[PDB]
Amino acid sequence: GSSGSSGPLPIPPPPPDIQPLERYWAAHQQLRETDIPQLSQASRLSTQQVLDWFDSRLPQPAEVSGPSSG
Known part of the structure; x- marks a missing residue:
């Protein structure tokens, strides 16, 4: 944890x-x-990052073999 910055980052x-x-x-x-x-x-990410993370994980509309879930 620290703050402050100038010229050379x-x-x-x-x-x-x-x-x-x-x-x-x-x-x-x-x-x-x-x-x-x-x-x-x-996860130290942006509110948008998480939104895309899950959204991408969710089952997208497309032809798939058939994953066994239960």
């Missing part, structure tokens, strides 16, 4: 964590406007 920030959404997804498999901002903060 400090080293670049580390990569985000998708684990937060990965677990939550398989855990509940339901994105909520309330869990959107809460999760995004964990």
Whole structure:
């Protein structure tokens, strides 16, 4: 945790964590406007990032073999 910056910018920030959404997804498999901002903060991503993450995960309209779920 630190702040402040001038001319020469400090080293670049580390990569985000998708684990937060990965677990939550398989855990509940339901994105909520309330869990959107809460999760995004964990994965260190933008509110839009999480929205696209789940949206992309969801079953898109297309021809698929047939994944066994239950």
